[PDB]
């Protein structure tokens, strides 16, 4: 579960870099799309942190 937490947190950093790229390219609609992927990864990361705390 700690490996899944590292996978989903590094995937969130990747999407944040895609959002940064979209903002320098002026494509704010793609920046919001990337932020939506980032949010589901950070919300599941908090669930895995909770699971890891129990474990």
């Amino acid at each position: 579960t700690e490996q899944r937490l590292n996978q989903d947190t590094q995937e969130a950093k990747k999407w944040e870099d895609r959002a940064k790229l979209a903002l320098t390219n002026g494509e704010e609609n793609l920046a919001r799309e990337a932020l939506a992927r980032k949010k589901s990864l950070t919300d599941t990361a908090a669930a895995y942190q909770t699971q890891l705390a129990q474990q």
Binding site: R18, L21, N25, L30
Partner: protein, 49 residues
């Protein structure tokens, strides 16, 4: 000729079909912008050398 003109519109529709299918790539397209600018930067350095 009129029925053949409708068949010619199948070629026009097929061209737009490939364009709409290519449109699925627009989210990924940012990678092409960085790749293309990068090759022009090192090519400018190679031309200046």
């Amino acid at each position: 000729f009129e029925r053949m003109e409708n068949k010619v519109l199948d070629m026009e529709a097929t061209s737009q079909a490939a364009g709409e299918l290519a449109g699925f790539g627009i989210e990924n397209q940012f990678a092409q912008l960085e790749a293309s600018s990068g090759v022009e930067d090192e090519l400018a350095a190679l031309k200046a050398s």
